[PDB]
Each structure stands twice: as structure tokens, then as C-alpha cells.
Design a protein around this ligand. Structure first.
Ligand code: PAC
Length: 235
């Protein structure tokens, strides 16, 4: 059984909680960066260690490595997301990916070109997300955000708040194709099917998309348990 390796923001280096729910029969291992805040200043303090964490996961027998942070991978633009991926691959000899690549792949899989943004972030990070998506030939539309920079604070946001955030972002641009719910620090699994039910458009969420994309890269065609959104169930 291929192990999937994940580089995660918190120092503790825990497998993000969504994995046990989405893919209960797949093994995940993780290595933690110790990110201090979800801000460019925070990213700058850990970004250089990503390659070393990739190498650790390789030594542990990982079959694929994903950098499981959207903003760490998009904050410098599309070229850096690609270059960082290549650096990880050259360091490990393994298939490597990032949570930003994951959400691009998920949005494309669901036919989303015009995308409403529902995010956890402050606006410098939101602007960088919009610029990244535009570089990648997507069209960011409405935007609502929570303005959070703490890693732990993001895990505390409840399902109903996240459903409402998505609905408000979509209602700001109701001819959008879908919604990006951005930040792998959010616990979004119960929010996704509710938003999709109510609005009739797909949602791509950072953490779940990261898992979907890593499992994709592992090349076994493993399928998630049902009810976590069209991204998973449309296979
Ligand atoms: O995805 C992000 O942009 C940030 C993030 C990822 C995982 C845990 C906390 C924050």
C-alpha cells in the first residue's frame, strides 16, 4: 500500500483530520513546518524548509508528497507554485504536488472557470489568491473572507459559519460556476454538501481537494467515502 506524505503548516506535523474521513483505508504520514501565522511574513519564515520536509517524507517511504497549504504555495504567484513543485520532485524523485495545484485541478475537474471565493484569510492573501487564479486562466468573482491569521483559530470555525460564508460569496456573484473555499486549516467536510445542495454549484475546498489530488497522484484510483461533494462523488 502506497503511503501518501504531507507537509503541513503546524509544528506538530499531524495528518490533517479530513484524511481519516475521506479515505479511512489509506495511510497518510505528515511532517510539520511550524508556520507562525497565515501571512506572507509567516510563509517567508518556513518556505525554505519545504524541500527538506519533502526529503524526510521520501526517506519514510512516501510514494507521493503534497505541500498541504494553499497560501504557502500561491502567495508568490503561479510560477513559484510550479518551481517549488519541481524542486520537491528533484529532491525526492517522487511525484510531488501542492494544495494550490490541488484546487486548480479540482476546479477544472468540475468545469469551474468563474469562481466565487470564500476564504479564511486577510486581504493581502486574498489578493494573492485572486492573482494566482487569474494567472491560471480562472476568473475570480465574488469574495467573502474571515480575516484569520492564526492556524488554531481556523480549526475553530464551525460548519454553519462556513456554509454561510460560501452562500454570501456566491450571492455576491450568482452567475459564477462554483466556489473555492480556501484554507486547509478549515474543517469543511460537513459544509461542502450543504452548500452544493443549496446552491446547485460545486465547491472546491482546500483540505479535501489536497487529499483528492494527492490520492490522484498516487495513481491507484482510490475513491473517497460518499457525501463530501461533487469533487469526490463524480467518479
Ligand atoms: O491552506 C492555507 O492557505 C493555510 C493553512 C493550511 C493548513 C493549516 C492551516 C492553514
Amino acid at each position: 500500500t502506497p503511503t501518501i506524505g504531507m507537509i503541513v503548516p503546524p509544528a506538530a506535523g499531524l495528518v490533517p483530520a479530513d484524511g481519516a474521513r475521506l479515505y479511512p483505508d489509506l495511510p497518510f504520514i505528515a511532517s510539520g513546518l511550524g508556520l507562525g501565522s497565515v501571512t506572507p511574513e509567516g510563509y517567508d519564515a518556513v518556505i525554505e524548509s519545504v524541500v527538506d520536509h519533502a526529503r524526510r517524507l521520501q526517506k519514510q517511504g512516501a510514494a507521493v508528497v503534497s505541500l498541504m497549504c494553499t497560501s504557502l504555495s500561491f502567495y508568490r504567484g503561479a510560477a513559484f507554485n510550479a518551481a517549488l513543485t519541481v524542486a520537491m520532485r528533484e529532491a525526492t524523485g517522487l511525484p510531488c504536488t501542492t494544495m494550490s495545484t490541488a484546487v486548480l485541478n479540482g476546479l477544472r475537474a468540475l468545469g469551474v472557470r468563474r469562481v466565487a471565493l470564500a476564504t479564511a484569510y486577510i486581504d493581502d492573501v486574498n489578493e494573492r489568491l485572486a492573482a494566482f487564479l487569474a494567472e491560471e486562466s480562472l476568473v475570480p468573482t465574488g469574495c467573502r473572507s474571515l480575516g484569520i491569521t492564526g492556524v488554531e483559530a481556523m480549526a475553530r470555525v464551525d460548519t454553519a459559519t462556513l456554509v454561510d460564508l460560501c452562500v454570501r460569496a456566491f450571492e455576491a456573484a450568482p452567475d459564477s460556476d462554483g466556489i473555492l473555499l480556501s484554507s486547509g486549516g478549515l474543517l469543511t467536510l460537513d459544509a461542502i454538501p450543504e452548500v452544493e445542495r443549496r446552491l446547485g454549484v460545486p465547491v472546491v475546498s482546500s483540505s479535501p481537494a489536497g487529499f483528492w489530488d494527492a490520492v490522484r497522484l498516487a495513481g491507484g484510483g482510490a475513491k473517497a467515502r460518499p457525501g463530501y461533494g461533487r469533487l469526490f462523488d463524480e467518479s
